[PDB]
Amino acid sequence: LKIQVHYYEDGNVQLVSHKDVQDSVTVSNEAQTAKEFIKIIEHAENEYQTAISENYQTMSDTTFKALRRQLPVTRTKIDWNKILSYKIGKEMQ
Amino acid sequence: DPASGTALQEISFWLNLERALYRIQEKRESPEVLLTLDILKHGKRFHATVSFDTDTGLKQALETVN
Amino acid sequence: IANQPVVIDNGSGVIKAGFAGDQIPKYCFPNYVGRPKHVRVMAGALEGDIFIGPKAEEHRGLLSIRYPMEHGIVKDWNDMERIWQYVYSKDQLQTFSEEHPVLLTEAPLNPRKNRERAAEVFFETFNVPALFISMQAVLSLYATGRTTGVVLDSGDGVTHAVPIYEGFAMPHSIMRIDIAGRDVSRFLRLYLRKEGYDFHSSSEFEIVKAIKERACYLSINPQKDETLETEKAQYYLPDGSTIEIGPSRFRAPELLFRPDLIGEESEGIHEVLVFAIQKSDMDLRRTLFSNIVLSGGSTLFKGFGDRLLSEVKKLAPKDVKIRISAPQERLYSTWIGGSILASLDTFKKMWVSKKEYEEDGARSIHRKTF
Lengths: 93, 66, 370
Ligand SMILES: Nc1ncnc2c1ncn2[C@@H]1O[C@H](COP(=O)(O)OP(=O)(O)O)[C@@H](O)[C@H]1O
Hints:
This is part of a larger assembly, with chains A (93 residues), B (66 residues) and C (370 residues). Chain B is mainly alpha-helical. Chain B has helices spanning 7-28, 31-42, 46-54, 58-65. Chain C is built from 13 helices and 14 strands. Chain A: This is F-actin-capping protein subunit alpha-1.
């Protein structure tokens, strides 16, 4: 189930994903495996779309925090006047 | 002012500064002054010791003089 | 330029001072002011009215000891001026307040007026070349040498926890309650009255402090020990009497872990630590739990650290290494940290010059408060 989504309003963003679904069932009958094939399909697709949405939900604090935090670990802004004015004590350990 | 006075006065003034800063280095290198510095170092007071060479602009003055 | 920075560690109960670079504070004495109560009759008596330091401690019976600072906030500035002036006297420093920059410890979350009027006092009556007000937790961590960790202090009038990350003391996680040593002594006085022994004189409250300093401990189980009758050890007064304490020795410092006994909606020390840690970045909780430093004289009770460990384990999440350090200089932690901080070359750029104070004013201090 490969997905490609592009968005470029005042920028550029591309979502590329796929889930290597793997499932099995014995071919019992035709109508049974037809709607059962749909059962596996509805399962994996509802699962996959929902999971993708929640991956978007947990992205401000996990993925981005792997790249760039929203706020530093001190949870405050930067006193540029402090860093430039004097060394924070980094020389001392 | 670099143009204050005649040419020989300004040129001789830079010469005077050269030998005078060397005399300041002479007064700096005496063992009595070093003894006072040793007192402040042995007494764990690093302020006057480090400032004796950094706060005094004698080092940079002597290097430009040289 | 000046001679050397003087690290004056304040404290609502014990002021501590000395020059920077010193190993231990050479000058420490209680932060009280005693003036006589009786009548001068015989000539040749103790001349002078206000006494501070060892002389005020010696002739303790005559004085009417009061404190000018309470809960890290100065209530009387005249007595504080005399105390600071006493620090610069011939009995303590023998120097002048014109050739020494001053490092000044100060408790967090205090009013702006403390820094403002204290700065006026120094730069105007003392005319110090440079003043620098700082925190106390930052100094205690500098004294231990490590750099990231919380600091749990409980001096005489305040108690707080500061999660420090490499020197940047996180200002959004400093919990602070006002239940410290002096208040524990006060509650101990109440319990001594309930025992039958009365101590109410101002120069007798100090005896109550002495009892707190050498006859109290912390029970591990707070209730199991209350349901038993202890050995009821005695106590010798300076007078020579005898006081059997009993249950009024473990419930007295119990106040720090439950300020319900004093009737207050504040929290215990353990809750101050856990809230100070939990109101921080989730990525630093394990590092903060692995580095807790105690300081302040109220952390000297018997069984203090052990009970703190038990309490924190009850509040911390499961299987997180909790580690409480407790150096041997909890009384001198902030002062030793001041000696390390002010003895650096960056301190020249870290203070506030007198010229700057005359130019901008108090706003310059709040600007360069860190
Ligand atoms: N052995 C002790 N046990 C319990 N409390 C003590 C002991 N020694 C001192 N104290 C209390 O601790 C206080 C000292 O803390 P202090 O140094 O005043 O902190 P700060 O100086 O930051 O106010 C004193 O008021 C005293 O009441």
